[PDB]
């Protein structure tokens, strides 16, 4: 027989991590692996139909994606849906697939609103989620002995679908659910300048441990403002939630990184300012299979899509799709091994959830809620040469923290600053 896979991704724009120009080679490699493996769907072939989720302007919209999904469902009636990645585009599509009892597979859409299975049933997320970042924050708080208060700041920028809103809300809800501590939050505009002054005036009265969701340039400007104001690392600590590693170019294998220098004439001050800043990023795979997959992915993408891919953690986004696709196929086989049909949905989704799988990224696990557990990394600056390096990794499967080559997380004073000063705010 034939198995139909429906893809709803931007087929023209090549600026999103889930763009077709970067996902298509991964899907082709997954299909080739499935064909070369007699264990996965013997005697069956897999097809693929494509649809656009962008308007005439070329950005993902919440109007074109549901229409494309409806048209694909009416014309082809597929068994599974791939994508989209944008939350506003994916939510109506997810609801439509839940109503149609058609399984949905995605690696994007990490908003907390997808965490309820009563509404978004039969939906699997094989990519990173914002709740695992909350788990990492809770684990770090437990390890470092902070139990009283925290502060959260996020920046607003026109043009994107509120990237720093969903992450902050998900992390904040997860921290409240798991740690039971008093947490604050605030939004600021990075385009304005008086907003920075107001932030530096109001931060000392609201807490000492601060998480920031903004651009690397905004983070550097804020750090310089804090340094000139009088803020020091002996009382304050700053965390930057750069998941994809933009301040540190790529976030790839070991190499000296200096994010505080750009030749603006004030690198000396920025080097001293960055002594109180740490970065939280994703964890890159280490096995050589990931490197081979990256090589083949880049080669095939260059030859077949006229696109030149770079090195970075963004490449971890399409690969997950690949792995997820493989997992789905396995589940289907199990259904076909138990006297079922490929048009059930519930059995396949239940078999996928709470399972351990092996892929190019490594050994992944899907819990009972159908959310892949992700590992995290914490970067720290070398006190000798002033270069950032990886010092701590967090495994979400066992929920554990491990150092790298015996590296010690240094502090300006000697031990982490207290969460609340003895004199209070």
């Amino acid at each position: 027989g034939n198995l139909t896979v429906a893809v709803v991704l931007p087929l023209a724009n090549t600026s999103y991590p889930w763009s077709w120009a970067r996902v298509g080679p991964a899907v082709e490699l997954a299909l080739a692996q499935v064909k070369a493996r007699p264990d996965l769907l013997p005697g069956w072939t897999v097809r693929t139909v494509l649809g656009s989720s962008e308007n005439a302007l070329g950005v993902c919209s919440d109007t074109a994606a549901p229409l494309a999904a409806v048209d694909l469902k009416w014309e082809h009636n597929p068994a599974v849906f791939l994508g989209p990645g944008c939350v506003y585009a994916a939510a109506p599509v997810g609801r439509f697939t839940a109503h149609w009892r058609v399984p949905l597979l995605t690696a994007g859409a990490p908003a907390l609103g997808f965490g309820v299975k009563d509404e978004y049933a039969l939906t699997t997320r094989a990519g990173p989620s914002y709740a695992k970042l909350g788990d990492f924050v809770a684990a770090l708080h437990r390890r470092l002995g902070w139990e009283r208060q925290a502060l959260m700041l996020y920046a607003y920028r026109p043009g994107d679908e509120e990237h720093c809103f969903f992450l902050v809300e998900g992390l904040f809800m997860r921290v409240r659910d798991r740690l039971n501590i008093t947490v604050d939050h605030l939004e600021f505009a990075e385009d304005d300048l008086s907003h920075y002054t107001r932030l530096l005036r109001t931060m000392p009265r609201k807490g000492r441990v601060i998480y920031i969701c903004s651009s690397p340039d905004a983070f550097r400007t804020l750090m310089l403002l804090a340094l000139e104001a009088g803020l020091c690392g002996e009382d304050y600590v700053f965390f930057h939630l750069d998941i994809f590693g933009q301040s540190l170019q790529g976030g790839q294998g070991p190499a000296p990184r200096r994010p505080w220098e750009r030749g603006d004439g004030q690198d000396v001050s920025a080097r001293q300012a960055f002594q109180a800043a740490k970065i939280i990023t994703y964890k890159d795979p280490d096995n050589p299979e990931y490197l081979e997959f990256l090589k083949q992915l880049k080669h095939l993408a260059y030859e077949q899509f006229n696109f030149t891919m770079e090195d970075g953690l963004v490449n971890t986004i399409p690969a997950s799709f690949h792995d997820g696709l493989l997992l789905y196929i396995q589940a289907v086989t199990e259904t076909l091994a138990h006297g079922g049909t490929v048009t059930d949905g519930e059995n396949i989704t239940q078999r996928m959830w709470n399972r351990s799988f092996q892929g190019v990224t490594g050994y992944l696990k899907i819990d009972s809620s159908g959310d892949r557990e992700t590992d995290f990394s914490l970067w720290d600056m070398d006190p000798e040469n002033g270069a950032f390096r990886v010092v701590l990794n967090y495994n979400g499967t066992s929920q554990e923290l491990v150092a790298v080559s015996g590296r010690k997380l240094n502090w300006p004073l000697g031990y982490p600053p207290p969460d609340i000063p003895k004199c209070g705010f």
Partner: antibody, heavy 123, light 107 residues
Framework: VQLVQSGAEVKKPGASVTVSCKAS????????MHWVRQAPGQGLEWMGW????????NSAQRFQGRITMTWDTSISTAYMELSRLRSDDTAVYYC?????????????????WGQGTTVTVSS | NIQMTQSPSSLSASVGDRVTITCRAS??????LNWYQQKPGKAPKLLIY???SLQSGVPSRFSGSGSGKDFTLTISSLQPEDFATYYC????????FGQGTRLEIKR
């Protein structure tokens, strides 16, 4: 390839009925087994099917409540048990084989059919 | 589920004529369709196994075609033994049977 059925009993509503289907002449554990019922004047009506080698079963939403299908590979026989019979269960039953099990070709049509058995429910 | 419709409900034709029957599905099915013929007092017998295959032991005068939501069954030349009730069944999902199509002679 042969398919032998036996039974024409009539009984009061609320009792149970058992239908046996014999599939001698071919490898019983190499094909699916479909049970299908047809009303006297309505038309054909798919009931369910079983897969012997993997021990799998599939039934309709409106029939899964009170039907039980089993098999015996020693003599290559299939048994269908229906309970909570009402006045709407007076019909003709057929057992058929179709679709190999080495490859999951469950969409193959039913090749060999049975003679059929008549079940009447009345007090 | 998928509801299946047959056209026409009844048709009268003579011997040696061209006859077509149309089966329509409420949802799109690629090639999952089977055709069965049934005579009174006898079990159904299979004729076409995909939308366009041809089961062993079937005369070549029967043909099947179509795809998507519409399929056609064609008999090039009717014979006195070709008058029976025809059913089109879908196998992509939980199988369902059509209402039937009775064929009779012309008088």
């Amino acid at each position: 390839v042969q398919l032998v059925q036996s039974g024409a009993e009539v009984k009061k509503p609320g009792a149970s009925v058992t239908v046996s289907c014999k599939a001698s002449g071919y490898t019983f554990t190499d094909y699916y087994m479909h049970w299908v019922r047809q009303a006297p004047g309505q038309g054909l009506e798919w009931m369910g099917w079983i897969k012997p080698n993997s021990g799998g079963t599939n039934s309709a939403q409106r029939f899964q409540g009170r039907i039980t299908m089993t098999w015996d590979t020693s003599i290559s026989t299939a048994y269908m048990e229906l309970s909570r019979l009402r006045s709407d269960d007076t019909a003709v039953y057929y057992c058929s084989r179709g679709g190999p099990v080495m490859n999951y070709y469950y969409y193959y049509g039913m090749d060999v059919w049975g003679q059929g058995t008549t079940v009447t429910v009345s007090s | 589920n998928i509801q299946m419709t047959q056209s026409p409900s009844s048709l009268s034709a003579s011997v040696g004529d061209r006859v077509t029957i149309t089966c329509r599905a409420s949802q799109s099915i690629d090639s999952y369709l089977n055709w069965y013929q049934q005579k009174p007092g006898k079990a159904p017998k299979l004729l076409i196994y995909v939308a366009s295959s041809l089961q062993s032991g079937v005369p070549s005068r029967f043909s099947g075609s179509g795809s998507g939501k519409d399929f056609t069954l064609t008999i090039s030349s009717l014979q006195p033994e070709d008058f029976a009730t025809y059913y089109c069944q879908q196998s992509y999902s939980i199988p369902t049977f059509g209402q039937g199509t009775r064929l009779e002679i012309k008088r």
